[PDB]
């Protein structure tokens, strides 16, 4: 039961009418707790998890100011980046960054992250040591030199060991029922005759939390890695997740196939067959 507070930030230099110049969504593990954005310089904030109703008004008023200041700073940085990469005005460009901290069961800090991308590609990453940076090119190497000359990671560590920990601790307490849980998958195999006369076996997993899961089909003396159709894990919209993996198999050979489900809420993997 390790836990993370994560924020996913996006700044857009020339967004469409009505679209955000700046947006960030905050999560604890796989549960979203808020939306912040700035549209035409107007900041807005919305709660997204029930425990956020326990926050004092001062939380939202400090947050509003953070949104305004972050949105302007990100816009300024998009302007500088356009210049250093000698790109054209009039085009829209994207600056993204992820901020997180992670604690263990005893609430001990285990790690933290700060990483940024420009136009969908890695730009700069803070290393595991929380003191040095990794760049990808000569523009981001300038950034690294600035941040290291300035000691800027000191102020990021002060954020990690200050407000990131504060909020992670408070949210895990106020949202304990939602957050300190693992819901195991409920799984079954569905059976679908095909026109050609063979069969689809679709192994389903529903109702699980958190999202991380593995579904695997195995025959017996055969590996089915390249035969499986696997959908990307997907939200049910009620806080749980679902997934399936399918294989096409000969009619009358269904009992040779086994679906295995691995999830942190299970004590041992489920092994499932088409029961019939």
């Amino acid at each position: 039961g390790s836990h993370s507070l994560r924020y996913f930030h996006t700044a857009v230099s020339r967004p469409g009418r009505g679209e955000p110049q700046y947006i960030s969504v905050g999560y604890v593990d796989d549960v979203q707790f808020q939306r912040c954005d700035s549209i035409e310089e107007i900041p807005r904030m919305e709660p997204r998890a029930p425990w956020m109703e326990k926050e004092r008004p001062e939380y939202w008023k400090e947050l509003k100011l953070k949104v305004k200041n972050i949105a302007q700073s990100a816009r300024a940085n998009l302007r500088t980046l356009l210049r250093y990469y000698n790109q054209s005005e009039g085009g829209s460009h994207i600056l993204q960054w992820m901020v997180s901290c992670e604690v263990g069961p005893d609430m001990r800090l285990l790690g933290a992250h700060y990483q940024a991308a420009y136009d969908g590609s890695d730009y700069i990453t803070l290393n595991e040591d929380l003191s040095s940076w990794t760049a990808v090119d000569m523009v981001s190497q300038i950034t690294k030199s600035r941040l290291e000359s300035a000691g800027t990671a000191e102020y990021f560590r002060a954020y990690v060991e200050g407000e990131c920990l504060e909020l992670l601790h408070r949210f895990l307490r106020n949202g304990k029922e939602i957050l300190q849980r693992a819901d195991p998958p409920k799984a079954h195999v569905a059976h679908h005759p095909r026109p050609k006369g063979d069969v689809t076996l679709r192994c389903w997993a529903l109702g699980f939390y958190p999202a991380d899961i593995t579904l695997t089909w195995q025959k017996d003396e055969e590996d089915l890695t390249q035969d499986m159709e696997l959908v990307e894990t997907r939200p049910s919209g009620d806080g749980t997740f679902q997934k399936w993996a399918a294989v096409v198999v000969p009619s009358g050979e269904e009992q040779r196939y086994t679906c295995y489900v691995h999830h942190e809420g299970l004590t041992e993997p489920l092994a499932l067959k088409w029961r019939s």
């Binding site: 972050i70 300024a76 980046l81 960054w97 901020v99 700060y114 981001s140 600035r146 990021f156 407000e163």
Partner: peptide, 7 residues
């Protein structure tokens, strides 16, 4: 809710 100037 933290931001570093990259340039």
């Amino acid at each position: 809710m933290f931001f570093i100037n990259v340039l």
